[PDB]
Symmetry: D2
Subunit: 132 residues, 4 copies
């Protein structure tokens, strides 16, 4: 429960069963992750502008209750794991106390088309957010 | 000169009304357009590879009948307009003789900076378009 | 009334050319439209729940300049035309006063599972905010 | 068991020039719908009978990217089957190279509540499990 990102469900994101399609959640996770990084003073667009990337190597999502058009969801994200070459975010998607789904995204760090260590200045800033 | 691209509707593409969301149609037109260029011997991934791009500058769609999950749609595409700087594609989205939607897409050419359509590419496109 | 919807571009919405894919704009116009209906005292989820629908019969977009990840865009929406059985919305997608795209969406009104006239109460409400 | 060939769409590519990780779930869904089709269970027909296979969990591991211009193949099999749940495992490949692997876990919904997979449907599935 470090940062919270509010997301208003979009009509286009609902499926035939009348709920947010399960593939949409990864996008919600990305939005929250991006917001987290920005709030930490590491706006992601500026990171990639330096030739630094945090590509997703693994995704995991458990859907407990659905989100629907007309609702607003809150995505809580924190940096659960941080190493010199990788990061792991964990998320909780809820609506007014009710957990809707929970998941995580494992990332590697890419600098100039190659897996590498997270540059110092970015590592330093992220470290403050990671509990050692 | 018209080409047909068949697309099986994906579950993810339908909305609450139980039909293919209207925003998805543009993606259908894209796959059809890419299919059209590929058949013409102009695989778009290769066109961009050489630094040439056909950005969309105008989109238009009229929805007559919905498409539903479990169906296969057919997209007929043809190059309606061609110039040394722009292109206009028109389409018909149908399902077994029924017209679901019609529209178009106008494009410009970039090499990012605007530019005329490169010769070799223009010659090919030209064979697909007639005044 | 003119609603203004601030949209933060998502990484998932940008394509290979490093810009927001043209197909995404329709989703933007839809979100802005929803906002507009909300401010019009007609939250769409509640309208739909009533069995009333506003399906899109026509869409039109002109793209003048790209939007990119890291940017926030504003979509100004106006109810351009209103008839007993239809409505036409017009939009402007801008970034810092710079017009990136403009378009419209034409809708019909479906009651239950049939194309019909816009319910009086909803029509009246729309005939005052514009 | 099942093999679904999918042509990467331009709209599916991201700034890094590869297919966005969120698209993969959509690929798994088409491959899954295909697998059901091949088992004599066209999904649209299933839902029409008031039977659904909502996703309760998803997992994906990305080894190599997919790019526009390429065609990928999703191999899917029914790894787990019970009277109330299903577990599909997938492999996304290109020219024999593994791009990603994952799974989707499902519950069965008849009408509006979790329920046992109907007899005929379970039967057709157990044969492929």
């Amino acid at each position: 429960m470090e940062s919270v990102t509010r997301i208003k469900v979009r009509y286009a994101e609902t499926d035939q069963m009348g709920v947010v399609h399960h593939s949409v959640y990864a996008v919600y996770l990305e939005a929250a992750r991006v917001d987290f990084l920005e709030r930490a003073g590491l706006p992601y667009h500026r990171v990639e502008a330096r030739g630094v990337f945090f590509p997703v190597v693994e995704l995991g999502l458990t859907f407990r209750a659905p989100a629907r058009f007309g609702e607003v969801v809150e995505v809580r994200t924190r940096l659960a794991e941080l190493s010199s070459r990788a990061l792991l975010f964990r998320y909780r998607v809820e609506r007014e106390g009710v957990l809707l789904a929970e998941g995580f995204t494992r990332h590697l760090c890419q600098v100039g088309e190659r897996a590498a260590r997270i540059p110092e200045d970015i590592y330093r800033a992220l470290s403050v957010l990671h509990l050692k």
